[PDB]
Design a protein around this ligand. Structure first.
Ligand SMILES: CC(C)=CCSP(=O)(O)OP(=O)(O)O
Ligand SMILES: N[C@@H](Cc1ccc(O)cc1)C(=O)O
Length: 398
C-alpha cells in the first residue's frame, strides 16, 4: 500500500470538498515523490502537511470545466503547479509544488486579492519549521500587497514548498497589481531598494538592461519571488515576459545583452534543447519568431536573480511548452532525449510515469497543458533543467 492509502485509512474523514482535494492531491504528490525515490518518512511528512495546512484551504471541489476564479497559477486556473527539478550526477530529482490557497473572503473588501490564506500558510509553516525567516517576507508583503499599496493578473501572492531531501524550504511569490502610475517593475524595484540589501549592483544591471537595451525594453516585469530564509541567503527573482520568442532574443536575455560572458557552450546546449522540446526543425534560424500565440502568458518568460550575493545577476529562461510545442509527449521525449544525450536521464521513465498520472485521460500525445514550462539555467558549461506541471483540474474535468 502507498503512503496516501495508509494515511487515508487512518486520518479522520473530511467534508466533501476537503476530501476531494485530499484524494486528488495526495495521490499526485505521493506518486511524484515515489517516482523521485524520496524516503518513506518524507512522503509521510509531505502528505501530513498537505492534510493539515493545504487541503482545508483549497476551497470548493471542481465541479465543471469553469474555474471558480481567474487564478494566475495556471492557464486553466488550477491553483496547484508541481515542479520536477533534474539533478546532475545521477542524483534524485527534487519535487516542489506551488499552491494559492483561497478563502470565502476572496474578492470581498476584507480580502479583494486573496492574500490572507497564503499568509496564514506561511505563519503556520514558520511555527513548524524554525529555520524559516519572515523578515523579507513581511517587508515585501507590506510594500507590494499591504495597506497603502496599489489591473490584476488574477492573483497577487502564492507559496511554494520545496522537498529538498531532508528538509523543507518555502518560497513566496508576489504578483503586484498595476496602476497607471505604479507598474509592477516600479513597485518591485522600490521594494528591493527599501529592503536593506548590502549591494544593489545586480538590481541596477537589470534596471539598465530593461530601460536602455533594445531587447530588454521588450520585457515586462510582473512577479517577485523570495526564499523564506535569512535575507542575506535569500534569492531575489524578478520575472519578466516578452512578446518576443526568437532564440536570438532568448540568448540575449540570458546574457543580459552580453553582460555575462563564458556562456557560449551552455547557450549552444540551450539552443539544442529549445528546438528539441518545441518540436522545431533543427535548422530553424535563431532570428525567427515562433508562430504567434496570443495569451496572457504567451511569449518568452525569464527570471533575473538580483540577490546581492553576486554583482552580476543570473538569468533563468522558461520554455513555454504548453503554448509552443505540439503535444506533451513530444515535448517530454525531446527533453528526455537531451537529458540522455548529456548523461542526466536516470529518472526519465519515472518522469514519464508522473506525466501519465497527471495527464488527462488520453491527451499526452494529442494536446499540451500538462507541462507548462521547461526551465533552463546556465551552470558553467551545463544546463540546470526543471519541468513545471499543471494538473489541469478544470481544462480536464473528470
Ligand atoms: C511558481 C512556480 C511553481 C515556479 C516559479 S520558478 P522556481 O522558483 O520554482 O525555480 P527554483 O525554485 O529557483 O528552482
Ligand atoms: N502562471 C503564470 C505565473 C508563473 C510563472 C512562472 C512559473 O514557473 C509559474 C507560474 C505564468 O505562466 O506566467
Amino acid at each position: 500500500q502507498s503512503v496516501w492509502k495508509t494515511l487515508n485509512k487512518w486520518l479522520p474523514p473530511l467534508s466533501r470538498d476537503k476530501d476531494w482535494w485530499w484524494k486528488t492531491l495526495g495521490p499526485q504528490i505521493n506518486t511524484l515523490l515515489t517516482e523521485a525515490d524520496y524516503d518513506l518518512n518524507e512522503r509521510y511528512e509531505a502528505l501530513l502537511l498537505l492534510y493539515r495546512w493545504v487541503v482545508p484551504e483549497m476551497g470548493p471541489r471542481p465541479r465543471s470545466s469553469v474555474a471558480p476564479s481567474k487564478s494566475f497559477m495556471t492557464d486553466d486556473h488550477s491553483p496547484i503547479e508541481y515542479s520536477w527539478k533534474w539533478i546532475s550526477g545521477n542524483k534524485k530529482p527534487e519535487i516542489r509544488y506551488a499552491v494559492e490557497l483561497v478563502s470565502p473572503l476572496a474578492g470581498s473588501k476584507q480580502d479583494p486579492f486573496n492574500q490572507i490564506p497564503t499568509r496564514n500558510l506561511v505563519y503556520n509553516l514558520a511555527k513548524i519549521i524554525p529555520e524559516l525567516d519572515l523578515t523579507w517576507f513581511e517587508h515585501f508583503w507590506h510594500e507590494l500587497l499591504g495597506p497603502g499599496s496599489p489591473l490584476t493578473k488574477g492573483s497577487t501572492v502564492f507559496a511554494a514548498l520545496e522537498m529538498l531531501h531532508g528538509h523543507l524550504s518555502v518560497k513566496v511569490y508576489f504578483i503586484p497589481v498595476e496602476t497607471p502610475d505604479f507598474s509592477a517593475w516600479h513597485q518591485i524595484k522600490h521594494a528591493i531598494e527599501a529592503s536593506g540589501c548590502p549591494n544593489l549592483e545586480a538590481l541596477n544591471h537589470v534596471d539598465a538592461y530593461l530601460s536602455s537595451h533594445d531587447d530588454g525594453r521588450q520585457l515586462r516585469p510582473f512577479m517577485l519571488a523570495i526564499d523564506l530564509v535569512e535575507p542575506a541567503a535569500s534569492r531575489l527573482k524578478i520575472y519578466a515576459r516578452s512578446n518576443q520568442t526568437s532564440f536570438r532574443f532568448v540568448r540575449d536575455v540570458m546574457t543580459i545583452g552580453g553582460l555575462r560572458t563564458d556562456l557560449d557552450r551552455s547557450i549552444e546546449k540551450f539552443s539544442d534543447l529549445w528546438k528539441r522540446a518545441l518540436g522545431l526543425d533543427p535548422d530553424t534560424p535563431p532570428e525567427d519568431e515562433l508562430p504567434k500565440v496570443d495569451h496572457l502568458t504567451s511569449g518568452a518568460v525569464f527570471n533575473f536573480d538580483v540577490a546581492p550575493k553576486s554583482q552580476i545577476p543570473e538569468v533563468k529562461a522558461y520554455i513555454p511548452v504548453r503554448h509552443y510545442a505540439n503535444n506533451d509527449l513530444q515535448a517530454a521525449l525531446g527533453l528526455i532525449g537531451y537529458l540522455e544525450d548529456h548523461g542526466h536521464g536516470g529518472y526519465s521513465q519515472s518522469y514519464l510515469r508522473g506525466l501519465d498520472m497527471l495527464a488527462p485521460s488520453g491527451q499526452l500525445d494529442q494536446a499540451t497543458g500538462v507541462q507548462t514550462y521547461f526551465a533552463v539555467a546556465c551552470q558553467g558549461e551545463d544546463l540546470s533543467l526543471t519541468s513545471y506541471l499543471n494538473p489541469q483540474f478544470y481544462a480536464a474535468f473528470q
